[PDB]
Amino acid sequence: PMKGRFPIRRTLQYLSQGNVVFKDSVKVMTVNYNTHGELGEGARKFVFFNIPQIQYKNPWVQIMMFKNMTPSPFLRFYLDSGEQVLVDVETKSNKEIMEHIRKILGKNEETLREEEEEKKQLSHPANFGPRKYCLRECICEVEGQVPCPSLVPLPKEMRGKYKAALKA
Amino acid sequence: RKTRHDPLAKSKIERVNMPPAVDPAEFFVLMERYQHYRQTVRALRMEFVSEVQRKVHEARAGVLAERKALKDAAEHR
Amino acid sequence: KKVRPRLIAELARRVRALREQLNRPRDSQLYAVDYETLTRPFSGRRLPVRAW
């Protein structure tokens, strides 16, 4: 089996289940959690499950964690303008923390659709080329157009061998 | 193709490419067609050049772009 | 990522530029023309046939 407890976390399907895509402002995210106490349980589960999901969607955002530095857990974001966003996550579940930071600092579903639509204009279907980039390589794959000579030999009248021989 | 340091062939030492014969009518008529064609294509080019400035200037300093930067900044506060 | 310097490539560049400015050919050499063979003795290049 897969080593470690809850091995589903080490899967690409689970890392892509995150719904927290930060904005361009968010540069640094700091998590302060306490190893023990009932109140801090949500923060521990947020560091155990959701932090991998947040870092996978935001690979350019720094995420640093500190243990037992304060009496209560809290999240603090450092924006590019110099503003700091404190988020007291005590007496809260990990789902509440994940839903709270997606509303104050995360993107909505409207801004995310547009991003995907801008990437659909990069791969034009009309364009011809390798399968990696384009659907078709040549226009001989289109029914009606003259087929490739490899598959269907062209007529002797359309080849430069006989044209040269016929002319001279 | 050759480089600058490669010597010329010895078969081309005495080669003179004589200019083509000229038909006065066709030549004069074609010299005016080019004059107009290039004048019509310069005007079209300028139009296309002005559309690239606008779009560029309509996304960073546009009325619909500055109306969204304030909505995004107002929702942040 | 520390590029090893190429000193001879900078010395030659300066020397070549200097020589091009002290040995530069004049207009008398460049634009002289022999009127029988219609060539430029400096470069041995024939002029075009419409200029002869």
Next chain:
Amino acid sequence: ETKKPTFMDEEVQSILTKMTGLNLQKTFKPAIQELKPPTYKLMTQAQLEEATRQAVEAAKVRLKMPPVLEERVPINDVLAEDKILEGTETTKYVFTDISYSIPHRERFIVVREPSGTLRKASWEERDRMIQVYFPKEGRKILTPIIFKEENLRTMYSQDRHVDVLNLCFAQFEPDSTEYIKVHHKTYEDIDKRGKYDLLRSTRYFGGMVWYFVNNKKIDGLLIDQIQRDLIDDATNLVQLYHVLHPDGQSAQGAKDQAAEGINLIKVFAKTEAQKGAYIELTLQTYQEALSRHSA
């Protein structure tokens, strides 16, 4: 003044939606395709009711009737005539604007003929050229040979009328001349062989009822509904018929007699329906049998 309701009106869609009906077993019929192992969920009585409610919401998105349009007008528009280019080429050029962010019905497709004429591509040329640069799954550049009369009849013989309509919807446009002929042929065959049930619980039923009501061929359909204890749908079909044809013998008679429910079928059967006698006999049997059940 007084406009006759169209096919997309809320009042008409609700009537044709109810006639169609909803059958999950037929709407979500097991497709023959590549398979994966199923997933199981331990559900309660209430979790199963919500799951069946979500399937009914998804079946109503799959039964969305396509709009019925009229035969599009041919494109005969010349942009330029250049007589100096005549004889300089043997074949014609077809230029297409393959700009992505443009609807295909606003896309410019021109044809430079060997006579120097720069015209607009015809509908058949537009649709074909749009499948070369914007290919759509299901559509083919060259019209398939199944839409021929001999091949279509073979399909009709196997009660595969819904497959002919699905192939036509994926090959032709709603306002084509081949999409309207292929549909009418299917509807005409259904009326002849009484195969109305095949299109039931599908998205092609409303269009079949709209073709009969406008061409006055609802006698057979009404009989089928009566023979399946569907009087509710049978009465709305006459009501819809009346609306589209207000100045008719049946419509005027109704107003005079204020006919309702089963009465409308009787009024319609005599005044306008071609097979008036058969409708009464079929309707009679139903009413007699219903009385026994009521007892």
Next chain:
Amino acid sequence: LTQGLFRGLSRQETHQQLADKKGLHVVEIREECGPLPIVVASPRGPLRKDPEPEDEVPDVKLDWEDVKTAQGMKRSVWSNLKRAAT
């Protein structure tokens, strides 16, 4: 391999046993049939009114061989080879 195959194939729980054990409906979901819920088994006894508590993450032991295949990492020139009908 023979004594272990008969052992595991005899200790498998059916859908009816699962329903009776948990007093719930076993619903089959198929891509071919879309979202339609197919009830394959129902409890003969009293149907439970309370649903099973949803689990955010399940602590079930996984197999690297299966995770490595779904993520396109199990390269082998002997898998998915064309063979005869069995």
Next chain:
Amino acid sequence: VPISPYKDEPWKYLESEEYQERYGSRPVWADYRRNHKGGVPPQRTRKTCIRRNKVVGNPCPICRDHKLHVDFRNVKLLEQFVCAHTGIIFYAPYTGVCVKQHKRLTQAIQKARDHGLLIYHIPQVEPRDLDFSTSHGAVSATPPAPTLVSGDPWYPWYNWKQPPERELSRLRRLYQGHLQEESGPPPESMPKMP
């Protein structure tokens, strides 16, 4: 020489008693096995089982019986090479047929689906366009340009214009000894060879 009598009507052989006594209810390839080394066979079958009117040692299901004709009308035989649960044509190693007959089956299986003889899954696709209006100028009429109404070219320079004598005189002097015969105005329309 084997001259099968079902050449024209191949579907009558599968509904006969000679077929039922040999195959029964199973497919024709049920009782066929390939001969090869190892447990893993080659990923491709033999090109063909018949070479210059000569059959090989172990003919395939289609080549061992000369009465089995791969035609698009013989739907009962083509259903044995298509899965009844996924509608996919089996690869050659599955049934054991040669590349030549597997290529002829695929063509007959694809040609029976194009004639409505073979049932196959036809999905319900969505419309190509979100709108259906035909009011745009691309599909409608454009105001004809003035030049098109007057029977004139789009631009004047398209037409030939005779140049003045003084200008031709400059060119002649400019190109002394390197001239060509002056060209007259071209014909209004392209001539054709009678």
Next chain:
Amino acid sequence: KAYRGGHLTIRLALGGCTNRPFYRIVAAHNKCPRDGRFVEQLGSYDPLPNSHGEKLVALNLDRIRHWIGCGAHLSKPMEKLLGLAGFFPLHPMMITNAERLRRKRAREVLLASQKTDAE
């Protein structure tokens, strides 16, 4: 790659197999190879007639107008494809070569006529 000088040009990039030419309109650097690296593909041209008898020319007008406003030049073959479409004016040599062919074909009708008349 960095080239000394140069500019962008909307040209044709030859493709296809022997005796089956297929060009694909591209915007590419002047010094780059014909079929090498390109900035963008702006269309395709199939010279060979199809079953319907027509030559297909796909043009991304929106993107062709963008690169022309950014400093892109045009090749003669590509300036003759835009003249036939109606995007540009008919190239001067397209009008002059059509006149030369007329005079030529009118010169052949005389010889043919004389032969049939005199003989």
Next chain:
Amino acid sequence: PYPPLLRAMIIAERQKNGDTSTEEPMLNVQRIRMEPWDYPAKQEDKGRAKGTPV
């Protein structure tokens, strides 16, 4: 005038945006001053032959 297709696409934007007009689109070629090919150029941006006598 604009060339035929460009003109057809400028008259379709108008009618799409709602503008109704019968005016022709025309190019202002008064700015474009077409100079002759034999017009004196700038010799102060022109190069000189390199000193490699042969």
